[PDB]
Amino acid sequence: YEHTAVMPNKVGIPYKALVERPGYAPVHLQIQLVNTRIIPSTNLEYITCKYKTKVPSPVVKCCGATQCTSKPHPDYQCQVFTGVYPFMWGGAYCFCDTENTQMSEAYVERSEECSIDHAKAYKVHTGTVQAMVNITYGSVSWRSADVYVNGETPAKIGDAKLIIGPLSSAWSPFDNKVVVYGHEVYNYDFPEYGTGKAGSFGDLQSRTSTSNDLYANTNLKLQRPQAGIVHTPFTQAPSGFERWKRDKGAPLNDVAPFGCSIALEPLRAENCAVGSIPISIDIPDAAFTRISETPTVSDLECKITECTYASDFGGIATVAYKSSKAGNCPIHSPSGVAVIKENDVTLAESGSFTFHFSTANIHPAFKLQVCTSAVTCKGDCKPPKDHIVDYPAQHTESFT
Amino acid sequence: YEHTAVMPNKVGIPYKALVERPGYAPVHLQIQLVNTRIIPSTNLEYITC
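Above: the input entities. Below: the structure tokens describing the complete assembly.
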């Protein structure tokens, strides 16, 4: 009875399949893939952020030169300068007039915002998708368990053992190269660590926040201070993190395909509705009811009464139930034409009980399996009027 | 279900149409045009006496 089932990847709607175990009473499913969070394999390549030209205070030798050296600070720009007369609080102070030397030095450093407000590149591989699958199973009526997709993983949470996927729809909405910012995720071809052109994205490129080493192509060019005054002309491109916040591109949670949402959290891409998942469950046999205890319902009749050719469960149909015992009777349309809101219907001794459903074909000729009794609920449906609210329960469009 | 209906202009009698909304139970109308007062556009030109 290990109920294999191909199953559409779509998040917010149950998939009430039916266990046709030969010998005992069938049992309905209710498989709602409440989430499709993905979490691909990734690598933190480098944080970037806007620089801060945290200038070390220049040297001023008063009569003669002060040769600079290339200190190992990131992008340590330093250039000796002569021909000053530095006004500092008493007019000038160095008594020479051309031998007055000024050595300006400036290096690039991570902002304090780099720790917290920072873009973040990644080389993104495929990884392994997940889900908090609820099944309000059978008469168990509950399990809300986190699972995987790889087609040999069980998750014995509740009582049922369930194996999912691998899904066929391998579209990772993440590209190979991704930039990430706070919550807005950008599938951007970041240039690389160690290379980013100044002004362009990644002018600062630190491996992480702690990493004292980095790559700072900022085109930081010191110029001589003017007219014998102490200061430090640092001529520099404002960061490619400054832009990339107001001349950027749009976020993947606003431009992705096939229906995904995003988080700066394990780097999941939630709820990506695409393709199918070959899902298979091993039910606990204890949860089964033996066949000789559920009422046999045959010699019945089914008919629509007001079929709504729609998404919400507007389709209805009375069923002239013709039972033997009285009790519950799980139901399902093995044809995917009709999706039913009721998993189970209570029965007195051969009464009648309408259920709700939804279809996509004008003439819904769908079988209905009322606990081992098939029936065609043939009829005709009506279009609605009022179509602006969230996503459907029908999801069965085909040739009609 | 915005129930369009051509409807005879006649005052003192209801017009009990029926709402055939696909999906829910229909509902009857009872439209009685109790009055057809007109009030055209006019102009006081002159009193006489």
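Note for the figure: DSSP finds one helix and 29 strands in chain A.
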